[PDB]
Amino acid sequence: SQDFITIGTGSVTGVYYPTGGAICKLVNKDRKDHNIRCSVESTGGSIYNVNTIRSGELDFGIVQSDWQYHGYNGTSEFAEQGPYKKLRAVFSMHTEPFNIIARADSGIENVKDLAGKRVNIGNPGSGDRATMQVVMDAFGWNNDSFKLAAELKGSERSQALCDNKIDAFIYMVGHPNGAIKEATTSCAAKLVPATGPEIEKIVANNPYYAYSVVPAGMYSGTDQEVKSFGVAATLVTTEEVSEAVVYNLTKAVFENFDTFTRLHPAFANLKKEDMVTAGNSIPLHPGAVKYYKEAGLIK
Ligand SMILES: N[C@@H](CCC(=O)O)C(=O)O
Ligand code: NA
Ligand code: NA
C-alpha cells in the first residue's frame, strides 16, 4: 500500500503552498489510522505540477482550472506533451484572478498598458505564464511586444518590482497572498485592472474564465475594487494513485471542512457542493467519487 504522498504547489509566498500544507495537516492527523503521510513541495506552478504528476514524482498537484482542462486534453500549453488522459480531478477551491501589480509611477492603468513596458510574464512551468500567453494572444502580443519579458518565479517578483528592475508583474493567484502584500505595502505598488474588449472576449469564449473582483481594502493603496478575469484552483491527481489514497485525502478535507475553511483566508467562502463541480472539467478520481457518494454530494 502507498503510504507517502507529495502535493506539488507553487512559490512559497503564494496561496497554493499553504493550501498544500493545510491538506497535508488534515491527512497527517489521522496517519495512525490510514497510515498515509503527506508532504508539500514548492514548485514552479500549474504546468510543472501536471507534467510532474505525469512523470511520477508528484502524486497530487494544485492546478488552475484552465490547465486542468488543457493538461488532460494535451492542448494549448501542453500541445507538445500530448494528451494525459490519466489526469483526474479531486476537488476545486478558491478563485484566482489575473492580477497585475505595477509600480506607482509606471503609467500602467489597465492590461493594455503592459505593452512596451518591462513586464514579468512568469516562469516557464507556472500557470501565470501559460495564462499570460492567452492574454497575449487576445492582444496580438509576443515577447517582443514588451521592452523586457522577465520570467521570475513568484517568490522573486516583488523584490524585482521594488528594485526597479520591472515595471509590473502578473500573478494568477488568490487573495490575500504574501507576494502582493509585500509589493503594495513596502513599495507603493498598485493592483491594476484588466478590462476591455480583449478581456471580455477571453471571458465570453471560455467556460473556465469568469469575471473577477478584488475588493477595496484587500491591500493598502488599492482603495477601489479591481476587476479582471479569474480561474479556479483545483487539486488533481492521476488514476494511477490508488482509490484508497484519494478517498482518504478527500475525506480528510471534507469531513474536517469547518477546520479547512479556517486555515487560510482564501478558503473562507468555499462551499462543498461547488468544490465537487465548479472548475472541474475532467473526470473525478474514483476515490473522490467514492467519498462524494457516501456524503450525498454526488447522486
Ligand atoms: N496559479 C499559479 C500559482 C498561484 C499560487 O501559488 O497560489 C500557477 O499555477 O502558477
Ligand atoms: Na467564461
Ligand atoms: Na464542472
Domains of the chain: 4-95+232-294 (3.40.190.10), 96-231 (3.40.190.10)
Q: What cell was used for 295?
A: 456524503
- Helix ranges (H only) for the chain are 16-28, 31-34, 46-55, 65-73, 127-139, 157-162, 178-187, 197-205, 243-255, 257-260, 272-277, 286-294
How far does the centroid of ligand 1 lie from the alpha carbon of residue 34, in Å? 30
Closest C-alpha among 194, 197, 173 to residue 183? 173
45 lines ligand 1 (CB under 6 A): yes
Contacts of 268 (CB under 8 A, 6+ apart): 261
Q: C-alpha 34: how far from its chain's center?
A: 29
Give the number of other Cβ atoms within 10 Å of residue 47's Cβ.
Answer: 28
Closest C-alpha among 56, 42, 45 to residue 241? 56
Nearest CA owner, ligand 1 atom 4:
173
Q: C-alpha 224: how far from its chain's center?
A: 24
**78-86 contacts, C-beta under 8 A, 24 or more apart:** 78/47, 78/50, 81/51, 81/54, 84/50, 84/54, 86/54, 86/238, 86/239, 86/240
Breaks (C-N over 2.5 A) in the chain follow: none
Report which ligand 1 atom has the smallest distance to the Cα of 129: 10
Give the number of other Cβ atoms within 10 Å of residue 192's Cβ.
Answer: 21
Residue 156 CA to residue 197 CA, distance in Å, equals 31
How far does the centroid of ligand 2 lie from the alpha carbon of residue 129, in Å? 19
Determined by X-ray
- Helix ranges (H only) for 77-196 are 127-139, 157-162, 178-187
Residue 92 CA to residue 69 CA, distance in Å, equals 13
How far does the centroid of ligand 2 lie from the alpha carbon of residue 78, in Å? 21
Q: Which ligand is nearest to the CA of 127?
A: 1
Residue 158 CA to residue 186 CA, distance in Å, equals 9
Residue 172 CA to residue 294 CA, distance in Å, equals 34
- 60 beta partners: 7, 237
99 lines ligand 1 (CB under 6 A): no
